[PDB]
Design a protein around this nucleic acid. Structure first.
Ligand code: CA
Ligand code: CA
Length: 296
DNA sequence: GGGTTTCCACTTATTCACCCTTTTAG
DNA sequence: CCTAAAAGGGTGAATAAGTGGAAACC
């Protein structure tokens, strides 16, 4: 752990990458036949381990471990430590549908705080809570509690609270790219800066507000077969240079994605100076693109 | 102790990120 | 003609969520 993370940036990053967990596990050693585990977790690629360590030192809770060969995770399940998680998301609330999952996390916390999870009465309530959380109930767990159990919950419809949140959220779902377009120009290569944010259609309302909230961009309806998601995209350079860049200069990104923004800004300064029309500039832009994003 | 909590190892599905070329605008 | 802007996408893997196993605590 090194530095601390702004609380609203943390909530925005949690809106993007965090997830709440509730385990209801068969257990022959448990008086009620089941044991439980409640908490919150973030799984990232190895290269962003510094974010996990910064979150850990901000909250002073959580356990960092490997998550396969290429990922690393921060998990909070120590029950007393979950109070920190509750206190944070009460002061700095989530604004995506994940708020719904967090609200269920809170109900489960109340049950385990009353120690009711050690009685069949509490287990049954935890099953009702888990039925509306994330993937919901497995077929086995559903058959183990025959009663009628609702799986539906209230949709979340909230607004971007501030740029600090947007910087956290963008550090997760954002991308700063450079399109090399084969154009009918003299150089034969048009340089195009592209900024975009991706999100499932379950939060269409939040995605469309980005247009209004940022004063630029458009929405693209995408789908890979049976799956749908949205993509907010800005390609006009004046918007990128006047509206997108300054927002993130003043609300600093986190993770390696910050380096991608810094490099993205160099290309922006080149364009701004028209150096992107000279061949020496084009070669500098190619060098930058090669060493950012995957190429880094 | 023994029932309960906490942690580490590891997997799985799809929502992301990040990429491309072609077409149209101005 | 010329450059910027948008359109129209392709797709692998970093995410979100998850289970198995057990040391260890109260
Ligand atoms: Ca997400
Ligand atoms: Ca991410």
């Amino acid at each position: 752990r090194r530095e601390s993370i702004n609380p609203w940036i943390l909530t925005g990053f949690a809106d993007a990458e965090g997830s709440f967990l509730l385990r209801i596990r068969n257990n022959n050693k448990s008086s009620v036949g089941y044991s439980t585990e409640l908490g919150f977790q973030i799984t990232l690629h190895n290269k962003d381990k510094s974010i996990l360590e910064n979150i850990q030192s901000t909250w002073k809770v959580g356990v960092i471990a490997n998550s396969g060969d290429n990922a690393v995770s921060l998990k909070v399940t120590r029950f007393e430590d979950l109070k920190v998680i509750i206190d944070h998301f009460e002061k700095y609330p989530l604004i995506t549908q994940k708020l719904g999952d967090y609200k269920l996390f809170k109900q489960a916390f109340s049950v385990m705080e009353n120690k009711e999870h050690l009685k069949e009465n509490g287990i049954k309530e935890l099953v009702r809570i888990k039925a509306k959380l994330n993937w919901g109930l497995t077929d086995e767990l559903k058959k183990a509690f025959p009663e009628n159990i609702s799986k539906e919950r209230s949709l979340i419809n909230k607004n971007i609270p501030n740029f600090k949140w947007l910087a956290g959220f963008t550090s997760g779902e954002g991308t700063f790219g450079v399109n090399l377009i084969k154009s009918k120009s003299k150089l034969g290569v048009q340089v195009q800066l592209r900024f975009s944010i991706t999100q499932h259609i379950k939060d269409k309302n939040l995605m469309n507000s980005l247009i209004t909230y940022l004063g630029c961009g458009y929405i693209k309806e995408r789908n890979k077969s049976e799956f749908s998601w949205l993509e907010f995209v800005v390609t006009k350079f004046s918007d990128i240079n006047d509206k997108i860049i300054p927002v993130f200069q003043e609300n600093t990104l986190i993770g390696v994605k910050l380096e991608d923004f810094e490099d993205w800004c160099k290309v922006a300064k080149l364009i701004e100076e028209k150096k992107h029309l000279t061949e020496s500039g084009l070669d500098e832009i190619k060098k930058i693109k090669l060493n950012m994003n995957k190429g880094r």
